[PDB]
PDB file of all heavy atoms in Angstrom:
ATOM      1  N   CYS A  76     -11.155  -2.800  -2.481  1.00 62.92           N
ATOM      2  CA  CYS A  76     -10.777  -2.542  -1.024  1.00 62.92           C
ATOM      3  C   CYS A  76     -11.072  -1.103  -0.568  1.00 62.92           C
ATOM      4  O   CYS A  76     -11.150  -0.274  -1.414  1.00 62.92           O
ATOM      5  CB  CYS A  76      -9.269  -2.841  -0.854  1.00 62.92           C
ATOM      6  SG  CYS A  76      -8.194  -1.813  -1.761  1.00 62.92           S
ATOM      7  N   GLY A  77     -11.202  -1.047   0.682  1.00 62.35           N
ATOM      8  CA  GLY A  77     -11.517   0.265   1.348  1.00 62.35           C
ATOM      9  C   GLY A  77     -10.355   0.900   1.921  1.00 62.35           C
ATOM     10  O   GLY A  77      -9.274   0.269   1.993  1.00 62.35           O
ATOM     11  N   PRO A  78     -10.470   2.189   2.598  1.00 60.81           N
ATOM     12  CA  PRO A  78      -9.200   2.902   3.051  1.00 60.81           C
ATOM     13  C   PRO A  78      -8.653   2.265   4.453  1.00 60.81           C
ATOM     14  O   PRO A  78      -7.901   2.996   5.152  1.00 60.81           O
ATOM     15  CB  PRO A  78      -9.888   4.390   3.322  1.00 60.81           C
ATOM     16  CG  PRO A  78     -11.230   4.092   3.594  1.00 60.81           C
ATOM     17  CD  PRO A  78     -11.666   2.892   2.692  1.00 60.81           C
ATOM     18  N   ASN A  79      -8.980   1.037   4.760  1.00 64.90           N
ATOM     19  CA  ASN A  79      -8.432   0.292   5.877  1.00 64.90           C
ATOM     20  C   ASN A  79      -7.833  -1.026   5.475  1.00 64.90           C
ATOM     21  O   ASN A  79      -7.494  -1.896   6.209  1.00 64.90           O
ATOM     22  CB  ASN A  79      -9.608   0.058   6.892  1.00 64.90           C
ATOM     23  CG  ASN A  79     -10.650  -0.838   6.435  1.00 64.90           C
ATOM     24  OD1 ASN A  79     -10.590  -2.131   6.703  1.00 64.90           O
ATOM     25  ND2 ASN A  79     -11.609  -0.299   5.682  1.00 64.90           N
ATOM     26  N   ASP A  80      -7.710  -1.277   4.136  1.00 66.26           N
ATOM     27  CA  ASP A  80      -7.253  -2.424   3.448  1.00 66.26           C
ATOM     28  C   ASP A  80      -6.654  -2.090   2.018  1.00 66.26           C
ATOM     29  O   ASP A  80      -7.234  -1.460   1.262  1.00 66.26           O
ATOM     30  CB  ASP A  80      -8.365  -3.505   3.335  1.00 66.26           C
ATOM     31  CG  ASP A  80      -7.891  -4.734   2.397  1.00 66.26           C
ATOM     32  OD1 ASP A  80      -6.843  -5.408   2.721  1.00 66.26           O
ATOM     33  OD2 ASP A  80      -8.729  -5.159   1.562  1.00 66.26           O
ATOM     34  N   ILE A  81      -5.411  -2.467   1.848  1.00 66.84           N
ATOM     35  CA  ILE A  81      -4.598  -2.162   0.589  1.00 66.84           C
ATOM     36  C   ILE A  81      -3.863  -3.326   0.087  1.00 66.84           C
ATOM     37  O   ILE A  81      -3.812  -4.350   0.773  1.00 66.84           O
ATOM     38  CB  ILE A  81      -3.693  -0.959   0.775  1.00 66.84           C
ATOM     39  CG1 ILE A  81      -2.720  -1.232   1.921  1.00 66.84           C
ATOM     40  CG2 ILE A  81      -4.431   0.340   1.124  1.00 66.84           C
ATOM     41  CD1 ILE A  81      -1.651  -0.199   2.271  1.00 66.84           C
ATOM     42  N   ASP A  82      -3.275  -3.257  -1.095  1.00 66.79           N
ATOM     43  CA  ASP A  82      -2.301  -4.359  -1.572  1.00 66.79           C
ATOM     44  C   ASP A  82      -0.969  -3.723  -1.667  1.00 66.79           C
ATOM     45  O   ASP A  82      -0.749  -2.529  -1.480  1.00 66.79           O
ATOM     46  CB  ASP A  82      -2.742  -4.826  -3.079  1.00 66.79           C
ATOM     47  CG  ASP A  82      -3.839  -5.878  -2.881  1.00 66.79           C
ATOM     48  OD1 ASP A  82      -3.519  -7.150  -2.718  1.00 66.79           O
ATOM     49  OD2 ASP A  82      -5.130  -5.707  -3.144  1.00 66.79           O
ATOM     50  N   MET A  83       0.055  -4.529  -1.963  1.00 67.39           N
ATOM     51  CA  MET A  83       1.424  -4.309  -2.170  1.00 67.39           C
ATOM     52  C   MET A  83       2.154  -5.392  -2.969  1.00 67.39           C
ATOM     53  O   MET A  83       1.653  -6.413  -3.182  1.00 67.39           O
ATOM     54  CB  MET A  83       2.105  -4.075  -0.835  1.00 67.39           C
ATOM     55  CG  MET A  83       2.158  -5.163   0.174  1.00 67.39           C
ATOM     56  SD  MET A  83       3.029  -4.906   1.841  1.00 67.39           S
ATOM     57  CE  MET A  83       1.952  -3.755   2.502  1.00 67.39           C
ATOM     58  N   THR A  84       3.456  -5.071  -3.246  1.00 66.86           N
ATOM     59  CA  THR A  84       4.305  -6.053  -3.974  1.00 66.86           C
ATOM     60  C   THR A  84       4.591  -7.249  -3.008  1.00 66.86           C
ATOM     61  O   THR A  84       4.664  -7.052  -1.766  1.00 66.86           O
ATOM     62  CB  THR A  84       5.711  -5.497  -4.337  1.00 66.86           C
ATOM     63  OG1 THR A  84       6.049  -4.501  -3.227  1.00 66.86           O
ATOM     64  CG2 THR A  84       5.711  -4.740  -5.677  1.00 66.86           C
ATOM     65  N   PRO A  85       4.719  -8.497  -3.616  1.00 68.05           N
ATOM     66  CA  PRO A  85       4.995  -9.693  -2.750  1.00 68.05           C
ATOM     67  C   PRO A  85       6.391  -9.502  -2.156  1.00 68.05           C
ATOM     68  O   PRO A  85       6.580 -10.042  -1.031  1.00 68.05           O
ATOM     69  CB  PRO A  85       4.941 -10.896  -3.781  1.00 68.05           C
ATOM     70  CG  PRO A  85       5.137 -10.249  -5.111  1.00 68.05           C
ATOM     71  CD  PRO A  85       4.527  -8.850  -4.985  1.00 68.05           C
ATOM     72  N   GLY A  86       7.318  -8.947  -2.858  1.00 65.19           N
ATOM     73  CA  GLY A  86       8.751  -8.729  -2.357  1.00 65.19           C
ATOM     74  C   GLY A  86       8.620  -7.894  -1.087  1.00 65.19           C
ATOM     75  O   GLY A  86       9.374  -8.175  -0.160  1.00 65.19           O
ATOM     76  N   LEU A  87       7.857  -6.791  -1.115  1.00 66.35           N
ATOM     77  CA  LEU A  87       7.639  -5.940   0.092  1.00 66.35           C
ATOM     78  C   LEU A  87       6.797  -6.696   1.169  1.00 66.35           C
ATOM     79  O   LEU A  87       7.223  -6.649   2.376  1.00 66.35           O
ATOM     80  CB  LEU A  87       6.720  -4.702  -0.328  1.00 66.35           C
ATOM     81  CG  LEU A  87       6.571  -3.539   0.712  1.00 66.35           C
ATOM     82  CD1 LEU A  87       7.839  -3.122   1.339  1.00 66.35           C
ATOM     83  CD2 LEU A  87       5.591  -2.561   0.214  1.00 66.35           C
ATOM     84  N   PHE A  88       5.864  -7.515   0.857  1.00 66.62           N
ATOM     85  CA  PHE A  88       5.104  -8.343   1.685  1.00 66.62           C
ATOM     86  C   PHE A  88       5.824  -9.433   2.450  1.00 66.62           C
ATOM     87  O   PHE A  88       5.405  -9.798   3.538  1.00 66.62           O
ATOM     88  CB  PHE A  88       3.891  -8.889   0.937  1.00 66.62           C
ATOM     89  CG  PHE A  88       2.855  -9.547   1.813  1.00 66.62           C
ATOM     90  CD1 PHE A  88       2.114  -8.672   2.696  1.00 66.62           C
ATOM     91  CD2 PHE A  88       2.590 -10.919   1.903  1.00 66.62           C
ATOM     92  CE1 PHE A  88       1.021  -9.225   3.541  1.00 66.62           C
ATOM     93  CE2 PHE A  88       1.671 -11.298   2.677  1.00 66.62           C
ATOM     94  CZ  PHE A  88       0.920 -10.540   3.603  1.00 66.62           C
ATOM     95  N   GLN A  89       7.024  -9.918   1.878  1.00 68.71           N
ATOM     96  CA  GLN A  89       8.009 -10.759   2.408  1.00 68.71           C
ATOM     97  C   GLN A  89       8.791 -10.030   3.567  1.00 68.71           C
ATOM     98  O   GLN A  89       9.206 -10.671   4.557  1.00 68.71           O
ATOM     99  CB  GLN A  89       9.007 -11.306   1.408  1.00 68.71           C
ATOM    100  CG  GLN A  89       8.365 -12.302   0.413  1.00 68.71           C
ATOM    101  CD  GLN A  89       9.312 -12.586  -0.817  1.00 68.71           C
ATOM    102  OE1 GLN A  89      10.474 -12.677  -0.660  1.00 68.71           O
ATOM    103  NE2 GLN A  89       8.804 -12.756  -1.960  1.00 68.71           N
ATOM    104  N   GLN A  90       9.055  -8.700   3.324  1.00 69.02           N
ATOM    105  CA  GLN A  90       9.722  -7.910   4.331  1.00 69.02           C
ATOM    106  C   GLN A  90       8.858  -7.543   5.473  1.00 69.02           C
ATOM    107  O   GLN A  90       9.217  -7.234   6.587  1.00 69.02           O
ATOM    108  CB  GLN A  90      10.247  -6.595   3.534  1.00 69.02           C
ATOM    109  CG  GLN A  90      11.190  -6.877   2.371  1.00 69.02           C
ATOM    110  CD  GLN A  90      11.457  -5.678   1.555  1.00 69.02           C
ATOM    111  OE1 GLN A  90      11.579  -4.526   2.033  1.00 69.02           O
ATOM    112  NE2 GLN A  90      11.731  -5.919   0.252  1.00 69.02           N
ATOM    113  N   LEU A  91       7.402  -7.372   5.177  1.00 70.23           N
ATOM    114  CA  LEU A  91       6.471  -7.282   6.275  1.00 70.23           C
ATOM    115  C   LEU A  91       6.306  -8.625   6.999  1.00 70.23           C
ATOM    116  O   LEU A  91       6.183  -8.657   8.309  1.00 70.23           O
ATOM    117  CB  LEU A  91       5.070  -6.764   5.673  1.00 70.23           C
ATOM    118  CG  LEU A  91       4.942  -5.298   5.398  1.00 70.23           C
ATOM    119  CD1 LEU A  91       5.206  -4.353   6.765  1.00 70.23           C
ATOM    120  CD2 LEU A  91       5.921  -4.710   4.352  1.00 70.23           C
ATOM    121  N   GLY A  92       6.161  -9.781   6.375  1.00 65.94           N
ATOM    122  CA  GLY A  92       5.944 -11.048   6.881  1.00 65.94           C
ATOM    123  C   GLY A  92       6.134 -12.142   5.866  1.00 65.94           C
ATOM    124  O   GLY A  92       7.359 -12.373   5.537  1.00 65.94           O
ATOM    125  N   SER A  93       5.060 -12.899   5.591  1.00 65.76           N
ATOM    126  CA  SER A  93       5.144 -14.157   4.745  1.00 65.76           C
ATOM    127  C   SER A  93       4.022 -14.073   3.769  1.00 65.76           C
ATOM    128  O   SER A  93       2.894 -13.741   4.141  1.00 65.76           O
ATOM    129  CB  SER A  93       5.073 -15.482   5.575  1.00 65.76           C
ATOM    130  OG  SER A  93       6.122 -15.496   6.468  1.00 65.76           O
ATOM    131  N   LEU A  94       4.339 -14.561   2.478  1.00 67.76           N
ATOM    132  CA  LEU A  94       3.338 -14.622   1.336  1.00 67.76           C
ATOM    133  C   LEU A  94       2.080 -15.496   1.664  1.00 67.76           C
ATOM    134  O   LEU A  94       1.029 -15.149   1.136  1.00 67.76           O
ATOM    135  CB  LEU A  94       4.108 -15.122   0.078  1.00 67.76           C
ATOM    136  CG  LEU A  94       5.229 -14.243  -0.478  1.00 67.76           C
ATOM    137  CD1 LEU A  94       5.994 -14.871  -1.635  1.00 67.76           C
ATOM    138  CD2 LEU A  94       4.748 -12.800  -0.746  1.00 67.76           C
ATOM    139  N   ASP A  95       2.488 -16.613   2.463  1.00 70.80           N
ATOM    140  CA  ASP A  95       1.304 -17.571   2.890  1.00 70.80           C
ATOM    141  C   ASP A  95       0.220 -16.879   3.674  1.00 70.80           C
ATOM    142  O   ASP A  95      -0.887 -17.395   3.641  1.00 70.80           O
ATOM    143  CB  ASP A  95       2.127 -18.632   3.661  1.00 70.80           C
ATOM    144  CG  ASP A  95       1.076 -19.835   4.060  1.00 70.80           C
ATOM    145  OD1 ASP A  95       0.814 -20.607   3.107  1.00 70.80           O
ATOM    146  OD2 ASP A  95       0.661 -19.952   5.156  1.00 70.80           O
ATOM    147  N   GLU A  96       0.502 -15.761   4.317  1.00 71.07           N
ATOM    148  CA  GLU A  96      -0.463 -15.015   5.103  1.00 71.07           C
ATOM    149  C   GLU A  96      -1.560 -14.375   4.198  1.00 71.07           C
ATOM    150  O   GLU A  96      -2.701 -14.182   4.627  1.00 71.07           O
ATOM    151  CB  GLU A  96       0.243 -13.896   5.913  1.00 71.07           C
ATOM    152  CG  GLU A  96       1.244 -14.405   6.895  1.00 71.07           C
ATOM    153  CD  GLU A  96       0.725 -15.319   7.958  1.00 71.07           C
ATOM    154  OE1 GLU A  96      -0.047 -14.943   8.860  1.00 71.07           O
ATOM    155  OE2 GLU A  96       0.974 -16.600   7.752  1.00 71.07           O
ATOM    156  N   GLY A  97      -1.135 -14.013   2.922  1.00 68.60           N
ATOM    157  CA  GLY A  97      -1.996 -13.371   2.040  1.00 68.60           C
ATOM    158  C   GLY A  97      -2.163 -11.861   2.310  1.00 68.60           C
ATOM    159  O   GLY A  97      -1.534 -11.136   1.619  1.00 68.60           O
TER     160      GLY A  97
END
Side-chain angles (χ1 to χ4, degrees):
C76 63
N79 65 97
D80 170 50
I81 57 179
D82 276 279
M83 63 180 63
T84 37
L87 184 60
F88 190 69
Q89 294 171 32
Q90 301 172 30
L91 280 300
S93 297
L94 297 177
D95 186 75
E96 300 304 288

